Design a protein around this ligand. Sequence first.
Ligand SMILES: [Zn+2]
Ligand SMILES: [Zn+2]
Length: 407
Amino acid sequence: RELPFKAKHAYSTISQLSEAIGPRIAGTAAEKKSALLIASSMRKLKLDVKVQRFNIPDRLEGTLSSAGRDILLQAASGSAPTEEQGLTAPLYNAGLGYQKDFTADAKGKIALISRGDLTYYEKAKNAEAAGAKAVIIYNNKESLVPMTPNLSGNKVGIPVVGIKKEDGEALTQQKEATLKLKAFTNQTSQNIIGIKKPKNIKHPDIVYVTAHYDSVPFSPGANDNGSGTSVMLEMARVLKSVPSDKEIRFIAFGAEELGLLGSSHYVDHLSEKELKRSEVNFNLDMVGTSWEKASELYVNTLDGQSNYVWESSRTAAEKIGFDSLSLTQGGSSDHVPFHEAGIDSANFIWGDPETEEVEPWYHTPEDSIEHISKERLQQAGDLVTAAVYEAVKKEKAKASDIFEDIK
Ligand SMILES: [Zn+2]
Ligand SMILES: [Zn+2]
């Protein structure tokens, strides 16, 4: 029947998350404020809401200087802090960070490594095995912000930081640098779970509609992923008055940008009973960009194969007349823990129909509401709402499929 998804509602939610709150870094007060907002919104929708808390890694922050130049940095989660006075050591130019690039001269020095070829972890691991005191990785691409040198969930015993291209290029000419990094401990995040349960069905099939509500540092996260969070909530509003024998769980996942930490926690804590009842996960991540080229709505499965999510989406696209739906392979969002547990899942995201690429604003301060399209929210919202309606109406992954920006 009629499913009045309204993108204006989603836009309003994106404004609340990305403008009134701003960047929602995992573990920070902004993410906790966002969780309160999402929980409050779900309760308005007649949902049974719980907040599920979980520990996340220490958060590293600090500064870097050399020859009087202060350099903005982003510290890698899972690397070491410094003493409060900071770590001062000579710089060692290690090129791209292959094993061959570390001579005996590297021991006791801060390894300066250009991004490229190798993963950030491989670079940091090669430097540490070579006796480096710390690792500075500088971007090989221009960017508004220093790159995060994501370590693919590994732990490194020395500091690892990422800096901008022009800063690293200057650093290749300097003798030494000082790094000051503090670890903030006791970090926690949370998931917000709102359940629409059928009143007199015993052990119903479970359908998950999910989106992560955290963003990367310095990004307002309007599209990644205020958009998916907002479309998930508006779909919950639409489906509130839809009878169903399925148990529908709408979930806002925390700490996705650190490696799917919230969805991994959530799926890990499902009982075996719930896993057997688990039917399908529709994950929404980046569904509102205004970027003109991102005209194709992709359905990403971890193996690129069809599953129940694709079937329902294919059917929905036919019912609403939408011809720019494509099935493709992709991980690195919260559908992945569901897939690993054997539950049909997929991630919905707009992409360049030529190449699948996303907007240039991704993971930058320009991931802002200025670059959100209500028409894209509306079309994505109408498609996934119809797909979930089709599903509910009555009658281990490799590191590069888990993490984002690992090289
Ligand atoms: Zn995302
Ligand atoms: Zn992201």
